[PDB]
Amino acid sequence: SDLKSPDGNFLMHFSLEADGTPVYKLIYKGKDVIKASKLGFTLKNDNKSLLNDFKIEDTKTSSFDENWKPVWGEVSSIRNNYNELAVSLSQKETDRKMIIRFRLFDDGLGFRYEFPQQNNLIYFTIKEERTQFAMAGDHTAYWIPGDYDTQEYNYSTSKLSEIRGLMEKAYTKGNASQTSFSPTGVQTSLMMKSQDGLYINLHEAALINYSCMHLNLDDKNFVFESWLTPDSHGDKGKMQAPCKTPWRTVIVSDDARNILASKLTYNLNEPSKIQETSWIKPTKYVGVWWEMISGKSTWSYTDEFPSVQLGVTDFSKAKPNRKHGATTANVKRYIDFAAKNGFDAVLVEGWNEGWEDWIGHEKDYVFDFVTPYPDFDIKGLNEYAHAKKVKLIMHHETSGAVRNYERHMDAAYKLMKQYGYDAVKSGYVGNILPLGETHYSQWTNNHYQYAIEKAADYQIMVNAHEAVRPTGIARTYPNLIGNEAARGTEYQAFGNDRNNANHVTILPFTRLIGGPMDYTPGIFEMDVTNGSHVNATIANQLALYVTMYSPLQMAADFPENYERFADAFQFIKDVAVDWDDSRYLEAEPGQYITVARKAKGTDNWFLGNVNGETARVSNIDLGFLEKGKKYTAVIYADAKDANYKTNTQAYTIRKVVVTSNSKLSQFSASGGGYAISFYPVA
Amino acid sequence: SDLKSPDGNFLMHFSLEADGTPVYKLIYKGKDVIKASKLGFTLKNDNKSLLNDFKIEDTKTSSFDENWKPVWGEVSSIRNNYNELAVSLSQKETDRKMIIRFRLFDDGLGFRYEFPQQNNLIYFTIKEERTQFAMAGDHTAYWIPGDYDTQEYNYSTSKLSEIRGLMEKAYTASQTSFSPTGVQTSLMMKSQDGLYINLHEAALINYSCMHLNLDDKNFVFESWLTPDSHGDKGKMQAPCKTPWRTVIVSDDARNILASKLTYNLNEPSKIQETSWIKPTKYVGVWWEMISGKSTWSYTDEFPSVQLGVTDFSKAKPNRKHGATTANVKRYIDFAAKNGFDAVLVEGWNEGWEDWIGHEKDYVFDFVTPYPDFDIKGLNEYAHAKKVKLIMHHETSGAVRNYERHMDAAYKLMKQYGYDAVKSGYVGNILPLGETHYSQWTNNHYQYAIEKAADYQIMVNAHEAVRPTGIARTYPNLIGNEAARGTEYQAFGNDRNNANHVTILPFTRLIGGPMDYTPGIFEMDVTNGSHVNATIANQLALYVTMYSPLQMAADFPENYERFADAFQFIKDVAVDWDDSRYLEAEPGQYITVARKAKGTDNWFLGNVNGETARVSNIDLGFLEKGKKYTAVIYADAKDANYKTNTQAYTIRKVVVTSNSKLSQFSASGGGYAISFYPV
Ligand SMILES: OC[C@H]1O[C@H](O)[C@H](O)[C@@H](O)[C@@H]1O
Ligand SMILES: OC[C@H]1O[C@H](O)[C@H](O)[C@@H](O)[C@@H]1O
Ligand SMILES: [Ca+2]
Ligand SMILES: [Ca+2]
């Protein structure tokens, strides 16, 4: 009945109500974090469902404590240490079996349901999951609207009781694809902060063969309930026993830093299924990208036609619109910039026929993922890159046409291998075809998984924009080196409200739980070609290489902008992308994050701070340094009058020798931050 | 504005109503066959649509007369001869362009719509096509219920005015009807004054399958296309065009069956080298399962199976399994002994335990044999006897699952020397809400055929959309079922009406051959169902149900028992330099003689409906001044599809082009004749 974390700080009580409803409760340092919360499912075409009338048939406890080494990560080694309670239930009248498995870590709780092979539950359909998380009160939440098709929203900070009233404002419209569901519906990872100072995160782990979980708030009693994503037919999981749900996670601490530090989500995913992983490479890149995003260049080659039909349109005879970004000459310039500056790769978007019709047409045969435009020399460019020790990153926008991508996928991945591409950035902009499907159903989640597994067979890394938000599956498939799956830097170029200045102080407490984000930091020119204003300072942009953890790190700006601020650019050149250790020094969701990281295979550290709406002086504890050593520190900081709105390019650079006993104090501006390199003195 | 067939028997008048609605009319030998009929479309999210307010902006006429050689067919050479009127319309207010292209042949009319590249119509969605066929009167029709998911119905013969009343009875895994007066195409009719009229379509590509909805007050049919999973009836992008709509008409029913208009309206072959495409006579491990004797499944030990998890090597064999090495070898031996090309095997691969009723995604992998099926040995044994196996790919409606496995499956075929596959789509197309005949699913069938062609594989697709002549363009599509086949003779209920095979050639076969699986000699099968035919009927089907792919569906035992009758099945060819329909009346009888390709040999079959009848035929198709040995395989005088199915006679006689034959055919009976030069 009762389960504890290994350190004893968590207690989880499992019971049955009089009517056989399974309920759990969670206590942290003697305080309620999850009050009495019901568990189970409403099934389609089933009067009784799996909501009640259970009896406990068996319970089993055990303990686990091992370490494992990630391929890439924030630390060289991760501890997986929990106590487990497995409750075997049996329903009266139907005699159907459901197991509820709980794991309690020093970071909090994971639980899932399991259906063993049995006689009276075989094929079934989940109409709604009925998993609750009853809150102790009217917490502050850091939240985005519940949506079946996009996560690309600015966060709101409010009380639970205020979500309803804010929902209309927070639910910004005119995304390529978006579908809300409730006036009090929110996505996960959801971050909260109680009245009395607990940090509480609700999420899930190992989202496989199952629909993405959102949460619906009952704002009278402060109870969240699992709200899964409907497929094209309205169903919320076509199941076959033996089978099991993803884990539901409640990560909790009285120290916000421990939320960020937690590996609980990854610990609840299966160990790596990739045996030899040396082909998987953390990457720093530039690309022909922001040019199109910020309105200077096009993905398209020609404007001559009302629409294009691949295999019918003859691109070699079309009039070039002369705006195309992905020309041989332009791609060479980025390759030269990358090779000069120690970057691993160059993304190119708009390389392939079809871009004329990429957005908003609900077009099936939109791309073939193989045919270059006439002005992009695929063979020449990949030879030139390889001779300078650089690779191109393949881009496979699907524009929502999932079958079309599946049918081209093997030829596309083979083209990659033929030219020495080893990573692909995929996308899913637009409604999923055929219309009525959603981005995060069981069905579409299966496609993202299938793309990842097939890529693994080719030794290809995947970075998937507009896919379902991650849930720790990179442990199992470390070739998943990124997703977007949240509001990235691209929105800083899309006008409207761009990104809130404190955006990057929330993403780590929400979106980053489950896996890294391809955020595309490093903007130095904030007033871009199409008039949009990037809401950040240069030093904020440098800090992101540490504060937005990822094995895949873009420097998104143009070569000429980096040339203009070459001194600041040094930090982007110096910073690592993979780490033997990470130490969160300060963190408060929506306000600030400060973190230092030790570059893998070295004694070097890199630190960043990102700061929200309120300018703030931080006092930096340098005790993470090694004792007895002196380090050359270079501090890239906001000038005292820097500001994300009106003074974005004002920064200072200074060098100072420090030890583990040195204290540092630094002003960060509004939407600002700072970055620091530390190299031992020789 | 006016168009005529090359022979002058057809006149087609195109006009616009006062309000700009485009209308057509068709006249055959001075008699109205299509009265004034509207054309155009209702578009989704479009107030004006494409119904009216057109003006004729241009017209263009031309003529075409060429011959082409089919890879396989009823004749060695086919004439494509038509006059064309292309009417270029322009809508007021919108300025949108729509071309209506008409081709008028001696056999009747084809027309389609085309949208040229234009600035004010690019991406659009068809909510309903509004193509009409206004009838001259209350014709007799030979029809099946309109359905988005199956065509596996018995035909009904009735007046147009009686369809409504009969529809409850005619609508008796996956089926969805749509109207009390909805019917499928090809739809066959006969007017009270004796005209035979067929409505159908050709070149169903990148478009939704057309049904017809009858207004039974004014006798007007109107295109009713198949909705996709989102309810839509065509996601279109200009430049684009519809399939052709066809009105095949003659005062002689035999000309309907002879017509090649359907194929003539499809693009010429896109397969350059075609010698790998081989008309095929086959047997198979098949009827055993369909007639309740054997299973597709290997084990009954488990409530359900999960491929890659269930260990079939350790499961208890149910021993009912049809597709064992030993059983397959029996059929291989039988085929090689009897000069058959191939053996179909169903149930060879893991997953059959859950094939039906579960709406299961990962249902098959199309590659993993059961433990009792030695794939390598069996294909070597077959090839050593100069026989091939035919691959079976039931998808159970899980289309994405088939698409994902399709390259590896086609490679496995190539690896073991399979060159033909029988595919299936039993059950609801996944995800639920999709239909079998939507634009979306039709795309998949086409994709499977074009991909097969890249691998030099032939396709025979059960439960696919019914054909529309696409085999001219992709002649590796050597069959579909896509209608009620012989399997229904084993499923109890009403089985197949005795006159079924006298209607299919006037309906289903327009557009492409059917894998009907004839040749049943034992009509009272293991599960108690009664096949409604005589033996001589079954022999005639090798000629009267035209197909490059011909099964002898019964068990080897049963053929051995009636070895004398079996000789016809062994002798008959499967590809033809000429065909002559000698007698034909829909729902009553069909008699046809075909000249085996490359030879001076002929084969004739008659099939006969509910009413016993004496057939009286002239053998003047034979070459003049030569003598032939004829063997006539016929019903005994007391044969009967219900109570005396195995009573047949065999008689030999020398004939010439001046010989006449008179031959009794029983109820649900028929006769078959071989003709070899002296
Ligand atoms: O593929 C075109 C674009 O699609 C999406 O908004 C991606 O997030 C973006 O990074 C990419 O450039
Ligand atoms: O694949 C299983 C069965 O499916 C369908 O009913 C077919 O038409 C039949 O020939 C086949 O045996
Ligand atoms: Ca995006
Ligand atoms: Ca069938």
Q: What CATH number does residue B201 fall under? A: 2.70.98.10
Residue with tokens 């440098």: A542
**CA B157, CA B160: separation in Å to the nearest integer?**
9
Residue type, B78: I
CA distances from B302 to B313, B360, B473, B678 (A): 13, 16, 45, 62
| Site of tokens 């219309």 | A435
Of A544, A531, A540, A536, give the one whose Cα is nearest residue A496. A531
CA distance A58 to A138: 36
Q: Supply A136's token pair.
A: 């102790």
On whether the CB atoms of residues A113 and A99 are closer than 8 A, the answer is yes
A307 touches chain B (CB under 8 A): yes
Are residues B349 and B480 both part of a single domain? yes
DSSP 8-state class, residue A357 = G
Whether A54 and A97 have beta carbons less than 8 Å apart is answered as: no
Q: Are B635 and B539 in contact (CB under 8 A)?
A: no
d(CA A43, CA A20): 17
Exposed, middle or buried, A332 (CB in 10 Å: 0-12/13-18/19+)? middle
User: Do residues A110 and A101 lie in contact, with contact meaning Cβ atoms separated by under 8 Å?
Assistant: no
**B659 within 8 A of B528, measured Cβ to Cβ:** no
Token pair of B467 as six digits: 């054909």
Whole-angstrom distance, CA of residue A427 vs CA of residue A467: 7
Task: State whether B235 and B352 are in the same domain.
Answer: no
Asked if B293 and B526 touch (Cβ cutoff 8 Å), the reply is yes
Q: Cα separation of A294 and A491, whole Å?
A: 10
Helix (H, G, I), strand (E, B) or coil at B161: helix
Question: Measured between alpha carbons, how far is B421 from B442 in angstroms, rounded to an integer?
Answer: 18
> Does B229 sit within 8 Å of A232, measured CB to CB?
yes
Residues 6+ apart with CB under 8 A from B68: B77, B78, B80, B268, B472
SS3 label, residue A43 = strand
User: Which residues have a Cβ under 8 Å from the Cβ of B8 and sit 6 or more positions away?
Assistant: none
- Whole-angstrom Cα distance, residue B169 to residue B186? 20
Distance separating alpha carbons of residues B280 and B343, to the nearest angstrom: 10
Shared-domain flag, residues B227 and B287? no
Q: With residue A546 as reference, give the H or E element that holds it.
A: helix A538-547
Residue B538 amino acid letter: Q
DSSP B372: T
As a three-state string, the secondary structure of B475-530 is CCEEEECCCCCHHHHHCCCCCCCCCHHHCHHHCCCCCCCECCCCCCCCCECCCCCE
Residue with tokens 């908003």, as numbered in its chain: A360
- The rounded distance, in Å, linking the Cα atoms of A234 and B129 is 28
Q: Looking at CA atoms only, how far is residue A213 from chain B in angstroms? A: 20
* Cα–Cα distances in angstroms (integers) from residue A163 to residues A169, A184, A222, A401, A498, in the given order: 10, 6, 11, 34, 21
Distance from the CA of B574 to the center of ligand 3, in angstroms? 57
Q: What is the DSSP letter of B623?
A: P
CB atoms within 10 A of CB B304: 15
Q: Using a CB-CB distance cutoff of 8 angstroms, which residues of chain A are in contact with residue B237? A: 307, 309, 361, 363
Half-sphere exposure of A452 (CA within 13 A, CB side): 26
3-state secondary structure of A38: strand
Indicate the SS3 state at residue B371. coil
Same domain, B254 and B394: no
B465: which DSSP letter?
A: P
The answer to whether the CB of B336 falls within 8 A of the CB of B281 is no
Phi, psi of B230 (to 5 degrees): -105, 5
What residue type is assigned to position A597 of the chain? Answer: R
Of B176, B152, B155, B178, nearest to B166 (Cα)?
B155
Which residues line the pocket of ligand 1, CB cutoff 6 A? A 289, 293, 349, 397, 427, 429, 465, 484, 490
Given B229, B237, B306, which is nearest A436 (Cβ)? B229
A330 and A196 in a common domain: no
What residues flank ligand 2, with Cβ below 6 Å? B 286, 290, 346, 394, 424, 426, 462, 481, 487
Nearest CA to ligand 2 atom 1: B394
Cβ atoms B440, B430 nearer than 8 A: no
Task: Please tell me if residue A120 touches chain B, with a CB cutoff of 8 Å.
Answer: no
Q: Which 8-state DSSP code applies to residue B110? A: E
Q: Do B326 and B434 have their domain in common?
A: yes
CA distances from residue B616 to B517, B583, B591, B606, B611 in whole angstroms, order as listed: 28, 9, 10, 11, 15
Nearest Cα residue to B188 out of B476, B502, B562: B502
The DSSP letter of residue B67 is E
Q: Is B239 on the interface with A (CB under 8 A)?
A: yes
Report the alpha-carbon distance of residue A165 to residue A156 in Å, rounded: 12
Residues 387-406, chain A, touching B (beta carbon < 8 A): 403, 406
Domain that holds residue B30: 2-264
End-to-end CA distance of chain A: 58
Q: Helices B563-571 and B535-544 sit at what angle, rounded to 10 degrees?
A: 0
- Give dist(CA B219, CA B136) in Å, integer: 8
Residue pointed to by tokens 């895949």: A552
Which H/E stretch holds residue B409?
A: helix B399-416
The CA-based angle B436-B442-B444, given to 5 degrees, is: 100
- Sheet containing strand A605-611, strands side by side: A579-588, A592-599, A605-611, A673-680, A631-638, A651-658
| Mutational test site, ligand 1, from A490, A492, A494, max ligand atoms within 8 Å of CB | A490
Beta-ladder partners of A592: A588, A611
Whether the Cβ atoms of residue A217 and residue A135 lie closer than 8 Å to each other: no
Residue B129's SS3 state is strand
**Tokens matching residue A180:** 């809300």
User: Of the candidates A535, A559, A579, which is a domain's last residue?
Assistant: A579
Q: How many CA atoms lie within 13 A of B568 on its CB side?
A: 33
Q: How many distinct structural domains can be found in chain B? A: 2
Token pair for A465:
């924009």
Report whether A381 contacts A331 (CB < 8 A).
yes
Inter-residue contact A479 to A462 (CB < 8 Å) = yes
Domain end among B548, B574, B600:
B574
Query: Are the C-beta atoms of A124 and A237 separated by less than 8 Å?
Result: no
Chain breaks in chain B (C to N over 2.5 A) after: 172
What SS3 class is residue A413?
helix
Q: Are A635 and A589 in contact (CB under 8 A)?
A: no
Query: Nearest-CA neighbor of A293 among A562, A502, A503, A532?
Result: A532
Alpha-carbon span B177 to B267, nearest angstrom: 32
Instruction: Give the separation between CA A388 and CA A384, rounded to whole angstroms.
Output: 7
Candidates B124, B207, B237, B310: best to mutate against A (most CBs of A within 10 A) is B237
Residues B371 and B238 in one domain: no
Structure token pair of residue B292: 């309740």
Measured CA to CA, the distance from residue B376 to residue B389 in angstroms comes to 11
Interatomic CA distance for residues B58 and B97, integer angstroms:
11
Closest Cα in chain A, distance from residue B157 (Å): 38
Could you give the CA distance from residue B218 to residue A297 in angstroms, rounded to a whole number?
A: 60
CA distance A237 to B543: 50
Residue B601 lies in a domain: no
| 3-state SS assignment for residue A203 | strand
Ramachandran quadrant class, A255 (left: phi over 0; alpha: psi -120 to 50; beta: rest): beta
Give me the catalytic one of A353, A356, A437, A490.
Answer: A490
Query: CB of B552 within 8 A of CB of B340?
Result: yes
Q: Do A118 and B303 touch (CB under 8 A)?
A: yes
Residue A622 within any structural domain of the chain: no
Residue A645 domain flag:
no
Q: Do the strands B280-285 and B342-345 form a parallel or antiparallel pair, or are they unpaired?
A: parallel
Together in a domain, B419 and B530 = yes
CA distance A138 to A194: 7
Q: Does residue A635 contact residue A668 with C-beta atoms inside 8 Å?
A: no
* Burial (CB count <10 Å: 0-12, 13-18, 19+), residue A114: middle
In contact, A361 and A400? CB cutoff 8 Å: no
For residue A143, tell me if it sits in a domain. Answer: yes
**CB spacing of A436 vs B433 below 8 angstroms:** yes
- Residue A197 in contact with residue A136, Cβ under 8 Å? no
A370 and A232 within one domain: no
SS3 A508: helix
Q: Cβ distance A33 to A241 under 8 Å?
A: no
Check whether residue B251 and residue B329 sit in a common domain: no
* Residue A220 DSSP symbol: T
How far the first Cα of chain B sits from its last, in Å, is: 57
Measured CA angle at A627 (ends A626, A633), to 5 deg: 55
- Nearest chain A CA: its distance from B351 CA (Å): 14
* Residue count (chain B): 678
User: How far, in Å, is the centroid of ligand 4 from the Cα of B461?
Assistant: 10
Tell me whether the omega of the peptide bond preceding residue B268 falls within 30 degrees of 0, making it cis.
no
Are A368 and A310 in contact by the 8 Å Cβ rule? The answer is yes
Measured in degrees and rounded to the nearest 5, phi and psi for residue A497 equal -90, 0
Longest pairwise C-alpha distance within chain A: 76
A276 dihedral zone (left: phi>0; alpha: psi -120 to 50; beta):
beta
Q: Are B481 and B459 in contact (CB under 8 A)?
A: no
Residues B285 and B257 in one domain: no
DSSP string, B313-339: GGS-B-S-BS--HHHHHHHHHHHHHHT
Q: In what order do the strands lie in the sheet with B123-129?
A: B41-43, B123-129, B235-237
User: Ligand 1 centroid to A570 CA: how many Å?
Assistant: 27
Distance in angstroms (rounded) separating the CA atoms of residues B184 and A526: 62
Q: Please report, for residues B416, B539, B567, the alpha-carbon distance to residue B337 in angstroms, rounded to integers and kept in the order given.
A: 22, 19, 12
**3-state SS of B376-390?**
HHHHHHHHHCCCEEE
* Length, in residues, of chain A: 682
- The whole-angstrom separation of Cα A104 and Cα A111 is 9
- Minimum distance, in Å, between the CA of residue A233 and any CA atom of chain B: 6
* Bond into A242 cis (ω within 30): yes
User: Considering only CA atoms, which of A627, A603, A585 is closest in space to residue A677?
Assistant: A603
Residues B176 and B225 in one domain: yes
Residue B619 lies in a domain: no
B662 in a domain, yes or no? Answer: no
| SS3 state at A105 | strand
Last residue of a domain, one of B574, B607, B640: B574
Domain of A372, CATH number, reads: 3.20.20.70
Residue A590, in any domain of the structure = no
- Taking the C-alpha atoms of residue A7 and residue B162, their distance in angstroms, rounded to an integer, is 81
Cβ-based contacts of A443 with chain B (< 8 Å):
431
Helix, strand or coil, per DSSP, at residue A348: strand
**Is A490 a residue of the active site?**
yes
Please state, in angstroms and rounded to a whole number, the distance separating the CA atoms of residues B6 and B305.
61
DSSP A276-334: --TT---EEEEEE-HHHHTTSSBS-SB-SSSS--TTTS-GGGSPB-S-BS--HHHHHHH
Cα B543 to its chain centre, rounded Å, is 15
- Distant-in-sequence, close-in-space partners of B667: CB < 8 Å, separation ≥ 6: B498, B608, B609, B610, B611, B612, B640, B641, B642
Neighbouring residues of B220: CB distance < 8 A, sequence distance ≥ 6: B37, B132, B133, B134, B135, B214
What was the resolution (in A) of this experimentally determined structure? Answer: 2.0
Q: Judge whether A281 and A422 are in contact, CB under 8 Å.
A: yes
Residue A656 in any domain: the answer is: no
CA torsion angle A365 A347 A557 A470 (round to 10): 80
Q: Which ligand is nearest to the CA of A399?
A: 1
Give the chain B residue whose CA is nearest to the CA of A307. Answer: B122
| Phi, psi (rounded to 5 degrees) for B383 | -60, -35
Cα(B426)–Cα(B360) distance, integer angstroms: 12
Q: Which residues pair with A243 in a beta bridge?
A: A115
**Alpha helix ranges (H) inside B85-244:** 163-170
d(CA B116, CA A285): 44
Among A116, A53, A109, smallest CA distance to A85 is for: A109
Using alpha carbons, list the distances in angstroms from residue B520 to A252, B206, B484.
72, 38, 16
